[PDB]
Amino acid sequence: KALSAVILAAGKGTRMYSDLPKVLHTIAGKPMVKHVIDTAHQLGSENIHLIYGHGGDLMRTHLANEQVNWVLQTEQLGTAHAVQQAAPFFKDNENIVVLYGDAPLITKETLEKLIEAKPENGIALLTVNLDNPTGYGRIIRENGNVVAIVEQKDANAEQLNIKEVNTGVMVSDGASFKKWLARVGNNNAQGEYYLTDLIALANQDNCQVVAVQATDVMEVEGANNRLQLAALERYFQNKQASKLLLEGVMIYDPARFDLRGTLEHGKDVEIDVNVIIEGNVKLGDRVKIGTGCVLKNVVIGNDVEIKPYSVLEDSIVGEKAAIGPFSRLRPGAELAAETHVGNFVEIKKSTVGKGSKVNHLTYVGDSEIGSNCNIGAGVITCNYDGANKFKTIIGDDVFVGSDTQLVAPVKVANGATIGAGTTITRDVGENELVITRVAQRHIQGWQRPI
Amino acid sequence: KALSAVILAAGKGTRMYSDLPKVLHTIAGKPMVKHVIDTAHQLGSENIHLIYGHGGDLMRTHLANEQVNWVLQTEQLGTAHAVQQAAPFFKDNENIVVLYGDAPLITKETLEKLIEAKPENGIALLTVNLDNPTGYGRIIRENGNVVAIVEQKDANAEQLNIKEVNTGVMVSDGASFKKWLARVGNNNAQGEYYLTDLIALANQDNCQVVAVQATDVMEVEGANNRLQLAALERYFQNKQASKLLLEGVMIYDPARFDLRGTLEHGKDVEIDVNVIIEGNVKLGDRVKIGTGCVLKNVVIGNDVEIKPYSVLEDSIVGEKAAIGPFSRLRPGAELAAETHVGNFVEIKKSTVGKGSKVNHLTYVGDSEIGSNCNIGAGVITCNYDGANKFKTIIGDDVFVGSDTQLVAPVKVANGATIGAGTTITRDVGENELVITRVAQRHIQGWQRPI
Amino acid sequence: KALSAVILAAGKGTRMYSDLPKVLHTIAGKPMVKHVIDTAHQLGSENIHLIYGHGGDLMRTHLANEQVNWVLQTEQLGTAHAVQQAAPFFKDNENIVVLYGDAPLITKETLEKLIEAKPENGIALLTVNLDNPTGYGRIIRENGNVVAIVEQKDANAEQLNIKEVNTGVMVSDGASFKKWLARVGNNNAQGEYYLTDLIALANQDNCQVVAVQATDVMEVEGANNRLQLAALERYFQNKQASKLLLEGVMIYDPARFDLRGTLEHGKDVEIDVNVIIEGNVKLGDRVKIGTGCVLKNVVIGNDVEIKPYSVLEDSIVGEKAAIGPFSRLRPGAELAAETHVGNFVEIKKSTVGKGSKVNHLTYVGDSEIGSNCNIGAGVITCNYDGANKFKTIIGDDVFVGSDTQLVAPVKVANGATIGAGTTITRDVGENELVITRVAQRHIQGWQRPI
Ligand SMILES: [Co+2]
Ligand SMILES: [Co+2]
């Protein structure tokens, strides 16, 4: 049968001490609630009902492109009330899974087991075994079904020793949700309508509640503050790193690796300590990334070595290229195969052709550079003090001498040679050598301090 | 009643294999003994008696400004002898707490509980529960008082199973200390006068000894070598990071964060992995610090982003500024609001006005730069080969073309424009455009190798 | 008696998902098998028989200089078959230790205990206690000898509770190995000749098998995939860091320190977080290394401070020098005592004399620089567009003004002074001042946008 999800995401998250609402805080570069939405989607959810409230405008701007039903809750009166806000949209004969936007680590695999265990007209309840279950509702099993969830202060001596507890995550059909939610009351110390009470109501109707245990405790773990969030981050990063290691990526230290997006990789990739991968990154076979590198939205070809402390964004690098150390590629940098970019070099919105080298203390911006060029140390592309900036076009087999300024717009044709210390404002023709004629004064017998 | 402290700090620390004495080795940038002095002061200590000996000259130079009574011990004959060196200065009716300079993690909160538990004319003894208490003196409690501290080799079978042990940290009134210290002997295998024996002497006088358990084991942990010191460092850094997380600072990985001083922060601050905060640092609301940054003695305004691998010291940065990546601010750097400092840029002892940008491969030193200036790539402030160095003064709305040298002392007035590749030695007037007239030789048909 | 080793190293290592064979994957910069070879050599092995097969050509190129007997196995038929490939070369009256090339952490100390415990005409078997020994052969001890190794599916209830298990590492005399290996069969579910069966065969001959327990579990741990390899790496790095800490090296965080080679150190060395030491590195007394540094094959003198994010290779640095931050020393960099190298500076194959400074945005390559020189910001050594590159020779007490290009081959004699913005192509004489005569056009009333 079909499936839809409800995600509870209305909380202020006071103990985050933030202007953001609770579920917008990020794990691996992505809001907690976005993790849950994505999981619901890969589970096969037809509709995803997002219960939101606090920080509503921020939720709407930060999640504008998410395919969810925006259910704006005016007041928080308990989890049953929150789920009931979406209840009018439940199809009678689809399953509904209830998830929490501040519990981002829940896996598709666990939720698939949960849905499959759900008996007809009944509930599947996600539980978890804790070593210290103090404070949480204990799962009472008579034969093989959950007959009760006994809270801390109601439990007798032997019931407090039960380690299995309620997570609040559950699956039931839409018609059953509509029926039981309307029968939840608020006669308790908190004065709230608890979704937990559906287990009691199901047992009242002689409907079966089956428990499905979560594999990992951290899977169902939420974050009420940033310390707890940091713990989820580290668990998540360790799981990601472990997956990549088993796929054949050499990560020198998985505790010093961060992925905040997606990584496609070839074979024999080596990633040294303290590397951050952000956005969508693709690495070819035998790519080596040195320590300290940051790669955001990049494609790197086979056999590329990126040396330490290089920062690359929105860039493409061809096979057998060598980058770094201390290299910076800014958006629009496109390096061809067998190129060389060296220390204290910045390349922005420029193409660099096969075999070309740019190895020291250089800025290349808004440029096209051909194949087998030699861009000397200290070379800078610049503009006049005008309005918009303009392009520098360098052909193939050009030598640009050290500490030369290329003043756009300008064109340097194939095979040209430019001396060191030159200011190029006029176009340079094919096989044209341009050298600066300097005037110097020479003073003999100039004694420096002694 | 009043309080004074005695800090034992005379040890050579042989297993540190150092020219420094034991207690000068740092935790979080601060000598171990300095942590203990500070804790004693915040506890409300009127006097702090520092028992020192080995590396005496180094102690005096490294702790010159500490408000302590310098008690120079000529020989180490045991802890009771060390405390007795300060005994003549004890007021009869003040409390005295004994602390160890190689145990820097002891908290004010635990010591407050210790002092409060001290019965009149008696002792409060700090104890700790260990899982393996082998080697340490076991606490024997008859009813609710410590009647004995039984060492390892004296204990019977059931006494060795006692987990509570002696830390050596204790509180008693000054008159009681004077009395009992004079009655400590050295008839034991080590031939030393042990402060531990005060518990036996108190029980001899029908005075009560009460045990107060330490909350954390690491709290009372000492360091005899650098491996143990590293363990204290990591515990300390984790506690600091956890405090900041609960206060609402997003620290991506608290295991890769170091604070060596103090941090004042606003809300929604984000600190990426491998950041070091040193000295006194203040961060405004919504400050983002990228990976690899080092901030020492800096003030950063609201909404500033510092991008990866930026190093800042003794600097101020105004609101909405953007720094990095690979930016270096040296002492005296003062950046106004909405400024931009980019990769491979070094700013030393200079003010930079609102909206100005210095984005590539540039050194600005001993300079004043006004508002809305454009400092081109490759610009360098420099001096003549003389004696002292001098200042470069740039006004508002000045354009400095790429790869220009500004030769101090020089003044560039408001609205001036300087072409790329210029050497500025003479003052530039208001709305003056200065462009370099280059001489070039152009040789056609210059064939590069083929 | 004499000793030789056999190292099993023929595996494909399929779950590494690599073009390399299993044992060539590195720990601490060194192939796993190289760790085992080195350990065998320091144990005093006369011969080391390397059983290899998969990735044979890669094994031969990567381990070309290793002093081993290359035993090429054509098919993997079990560990007994592998050891038997080397059996013809065993001396009858030498001991033989069998080691695994994918278990690199085995220590000389444990193997020395193993060899010493071996009874005449018998076997010494290395065992290990696991908390969960499921899947491994249990050690059965009748009195004080191993009478059997009972596999998982043969063991009765009480035998499964035995924690001591077989590692496969063993020592016996060469004649005994020749005898028993010829009697190993393959009648088991896998159809393989197991070295494990030697224990049964020894007991058949009324020869004693003695168990020697490994001290650390990780010591005998192998790596079948890169996740397991990463675990070995971290264990290894932690052991190395702990050794250095106990020797008196201050490592701020031993979990963020990597040694991939050897480190000789003096006293009072301080190494901040995220430092990588590669190849052979020697540090003098009181060397301080800042965060993020990479040192490969370097010698650093007493009292040198290397500031953050400096990368040094194949370089020598004299006493009291100051390097960094953001400094790069490339192979052949030789800095004398009391030198200064600063941010965004690259030095390649150059000598720099005592007291000289090169503090900003500079490339010095293929150069000799004398004592007490001042190399200004933006200075670049460069070449003509020719064939080979050439040398820049600068004498003592030379001032090179900012943004000057030195065009090799060129010589600047003692005491010379060069103005900023100069292009030096001709030799400069002793006490010669060279200043560039610039031509500038000055346009008054040039109004920039408003
Ligand atoms: Co220039
Ligand atoms: Co320049």
**In angstroms, rounded to a whole number, what is the distance separating the alpha carbons of residues A120 and A171?**
11
Chain C: residue nearest A439 by CA?
A: C437
- CATH of residue C260's domain is 2.160.10.10
Segment C111-115 long-range contacts (CB within 8 Å, at least 24 positions apart): C111/C39, C111/C43, C111/C169, C112/C43, C113/C212, C114/C169, C114/C170, C114/C171, C114/C212, C115/C3, C115/C43, C115/C171
Bridge partners for A264 per DSSP: A282
Asked if A19 and A49 sit in the same domain, the reply is: yes
Cβ atoms of residues C383 and C389 within 8 Å: yes
**Which of C251, C306, C343 to mutate to test binding with chain B, by most B CBs within 10 Å of its CB?**
C343
Q: Residue B385 is nearest to which of C255, C326, C417, comparing CB atoms?
A: C417
Q: Are residues A210 and A236 in the same domain?
A: no
Alpha-carbon span C220 to C105, nearest angstrom: 7
- CATH number, domain containing residue B100: 3.90.550.10
- Centre a 10 Å sphere on the Cβ of residue C14 and count the other Cβ atoms it contains: 11
Looking at the structure, tell me whether residues B24 and B85 fall in a common domain: yes
CA–CA gap between residue B356 and residue A45 (Å, rounded) = 51
Q: Within 13 A of B70's CA, how many CA atoms are on the CB side?
A: 10
CB contact under 8 A, B246 and A227: yes
Q: Is the CB of B258 inside 8 Å of chain C's CB atoms?
A: yes
Rounded CA separation C412/C399 (Å): 10
Alpha carbon distances (Å) from A326 to A311, C179, C326: 8, 61, 8
H/E stretch holding B212 reads strand B209-213
Closest CA to C424 of A403, B401, B442, B420: A403
Residue whose structure tokens are 């180094």: B58
Could you give the angle at the alpha carbon of B232 between the alpha carbons of C214 and B76, nearest 5°?
A: 100
Q: What is the dihedral of CA B153, B157, B161, B166, to 10 degrees?
A: -30
Contact between B338 and B357 (Cβ < 8 Å): no
Please give the backbone phi and psi of residue A278, each rounded to the nearest 5 degrees, phi first: -130, 150
Pairing of strands A374-375, A357-365: parallel
- Bridge partners, residue B150, by sequence: B138
A4 and A111 share a domain? Answer: yes
C-contacting residues in B 310-329 (Cβ below 8 Å): 311, 326, 328
Dihedral sign (CA A123, A126, A128, A134) = negative
Tell me which method was used to determine the 3D structure: X-ray
- Which two tokens mark C32? 């796993």
HEC string of chain C? CCEEEEEECCCCCHHHCCCCCHHHCEECCEEHHHHHHHHHHHCCCCCEEEEEECEHHHHHHHCCCCCCEEEECCCCCCHHHHHHHHHHHCCCCCEEEEEECCCCCCCHHHHHHHHHHCCCCCEEEEEEECCCCCCCCEEEEECCEEEEEECCCCCCHHHHCCCEEEEEEEEEEHHHHHHHHCCCCCCCCCCCCCHHHHHHHHHHCCCCEEEEECCCCHHHCCCCCHHHHHHHHHHHHHHHHHHHHHCCCEECCHHHEEEEEEEEECCCCEECCCEEEEEEEEECCCCEECCCCEEEEEEECCCCEECCCCEEEEEEECCCCEECCCEEECCCCEECCCCEEEEEEEEECCEECCCCEEEEEEEEECEEECCCCEECCCCEEEECCCCCCCCEEECCCCEECCCCEEEECEEECCCCEECCCCEECCCECCCCEEEECCCEEEECCCCCCC
Strand A250-251, strand A270-271: pairing: parallel
* Distance of alpha carbon A74 from alpha carbon A82, whole angstroms: 10
**Residue type for B147, please?**
V
> How much is the CA Rg of chain C, to the nearest whole Å?
31
C432–B contact, CB cutoff 8 A: no
Domain end residue (candidates: C224, C241, C270): C224
Q: How far apart are CA A167 and CA B101, in angstroms?
A: 48
Q: How many structural domains are present in chain A?
A: 2
CA distance C403 to B361: 12
- Both C229 and C258 in a single domain? yes
| Spatial distance between the Cα atoms of A63 and A55, rounded to a whole number of angstroms | 12
Q: Binding site for acetyl-CoA: what residues of B are annotated?
A: 377, 383-384, 402, 420, 437
Output the CA–CA distances (angstroms, integers) from residue A124 to A51, A115, A176, C372, in the order listed.
21, 7, 12, 80
Enumerate residues 6+ apart whose C-beta is below 8 A from C111. Answer: C39, C43, C97, C169
Which residues of chain C neighbour B366 with C-beta distances below 8 Å? none
Q: Find chain A residues with C-beta within 8 A of C385's C-beta.
A: 374, 399, 401, 417
Dihedral angle over CA of A256, A261, A262, A263, nearest 10: -30
Residue A421 CA to ligand 1 center (angstroms) comes to 6
**Apex C252 CA angle, C251 and C255, nearest 5:** 80
- C-alpha span between A58 and A370 (Å, rounded): 46
The chains found to touch B (3+ Cβ pairs under 8 angstroms) are A, C
User: Could you give the dihedral angle defined by the CA atoms of residues C74, C77, C83 and C88, in that order, rounded to the nearest 10 degrees?
Assistant: -60
Q: What are phi and psi of A177, to 5 degrees?
A: -60, -45
> Do A246 and C234 lie within an 8 Å CB cutoff?
no
Q: Residue type for C258, please?
A: D
Pair C4, C79 in one domain = yes
Chosen from B15, B295, B312, B328 to mutate, greatest number of chain C CBs within 10 A:
B328
DSSP A250-316: EES-GGGEEEEEEEEE-SS-EE-SSEEEEEEEEE-TT-EE-TT-EEEEEEE-TT-EE-SS-EEEEEE
Chain CA centroid to CA B2, Å? 29
Tokens 């969960």 correspond to what residue?
A: C132
Q: A227 at the C interface (CB within 8 A)?
A: no
The Cα-based distances of A18 to A21, A22, B247, B289, C278 in angstroms read: 7, 8, 10, 17, 44
What is the sign, positive or negative, of the torsion defined by CA atoms of B134, B135, B136, B138?
Answer: positive
How far apart are alpha carbons C356 and C397 in whole angstroms? 8
CA dihedral sign, ordered A42, A45, A51, A55:
positive
Half-sphere exposure of C359 (CA within 13 A, CB side): 23
Instruction: Locate breaks in chain B with C to N over 2.5 A; list the residue preceding each.
Output: none
In angstroms, the Cα distances linking B334 to A40, B388, B413, C308 are 50, 22, 20, 22
| H or E element that contains A39 | helix A32-42
- DSSP secondary structure code for residue A182 in this structure: T
Residues A229 and A169 in one domain: no
Strand B294-300 relative to strand B275-283, pairing: parallel
Q: Rounded to whole angstroms, how far apart are CA atoms C330 and B242?
A: 41
Choosing from A265, A340, A360, A442, the catalytic residue is A360
Residue of chain B whose alpha carbon sits nearest to that of A258: B273
User: How big is the CA angle at A297 (ends B360 and B327), to the nearest 5 degrees?
Assistant: 25
Determine the Cα–Cα distance for residues B209 and B168; give it in Å rounded to an integer: 13
A350 annotated ligand-binding residue:
no
Using the beta-carbon criterion (under 8 Å), do C448 and B397 form an inter-chain contact? yes
Kindly state the tokens that stand for A403. 């500490």
**Tokens at A272, concatenated:** 């040294």
Give me Rg for the CA atoms of chain A.
31
- Ligand 2 centroid distance, CA of B400 (Å): 13
In whole angstroms, what is the distance from residue A194 CA to residue A172 CA?
A: 16
How far apart, in whole angstroms, are the C-alpha atoms of residue B104 and residue B36? 5
Residues C105 and C270: their CA atoms lie apart, in Å, by 27
Q: Which distant-in-sequence residues (6+ apart) come within 8 Å of A299 by Cβ?
A: A281, A282, A315, A316, A317
Contact B342, B327 (CB under 8 A): yes
User: Which residue range forms the structural domain that includes residue A232?
Assistant: 225-450
The answer to whether A164 and A129 have CB atoms below 8 angstroms apart is: yes
- C-alpha dist (Å) from residue C303 to C208, C241, C297: 58, 22, 19
Q: Are residues A4 and A94 in the same domain?
A: yes
Binding residues of C for acetyl-CoA: 377, 383-384, 402, 420, 437
The first and second tokens of residue A359, run together, are: 């190895």
* C-alpha to C-alpha distance for C287 and C265, rounded to whole angstroms: 9
**Cis ω before B325 (30° cut-off from 0):** yes
Cα gap B66→B60, rounded to integer Å: 9
CB contact under 8 A, B245 and A225: yes
C291 touches chain A (CB under 8 A): no
Same domain, A345 and A422: yes
Its sign, for the CA torsion A233, A239, A243, A249, is: positive
End-of-domain residue from the set C166, C194, C224: C224
Instruction: Please work out, in degrees rounded to the nearest 5, the angle formed at the alpha carbon of residue B66 by the alpha carbons of B62 and B68.
Output: 120
Pick the ligand that lies closest to the CA of residue A380.
2
State whether residue A81 is helix, strand or coil.
helix
Q: Which residues of C touch B328 (CB under 8 A)?
A: 325-326, 343
In a 3-state reduction of DSSP, which class is residue B185?
coil
Helix (H) or strand (E) holding B33: helix B32-42
**Residue B325 is nearest to which of A17, A18, A311, comparing CB atoms?**
A311
Q: What is the dihedral of CA B47, B53, B59, B64, to 10 degrees?
A: 40
Report how far ligand 2's centroid is from the alpha carbon of A313 (Å).
26
Same domain, yes or no: A212 and A232 = no
Of A190, A224, A258, the residue at which a domain comes to its end is A224
Packing angle of the helix pair C226-246, B226-246 (nearest 10 deg): 120
- Name chain C's partners: 3 or more CB pairs within 8 A: A, B
Residues from chain B that touch C383, judged by Cβ atoms under 8 A, are: none
Which distant-in-sequence residues (6+ apart) come within 8 Å of A204 by Cβ? none
Q: Which two tokens stand for residue A331?
A: 């958006």
Considering only CA atoms, which of A319, A257, A318 is closest in space to residue A293? Answer: A257
Same domain, C139 and C253: no
C163, C32: one domain = yes
For tokens 């300060």, name the residue. B86
Distances (CA, A) of A436 to A265, A384, C111: 48, 20, 71
Q: How far is A392 from chain C (nearest CA, A)?
A: 21
SS3 content of chain A, % helix, strand, coil (to 5): 20, 35, 45
CB-neighbour burial class of residue C119 (10 A; exposed 0-12, middle 13-18, buried 19+):
middle
Q: How far is A140 from chain C (nearest CA, A)?
A: 30
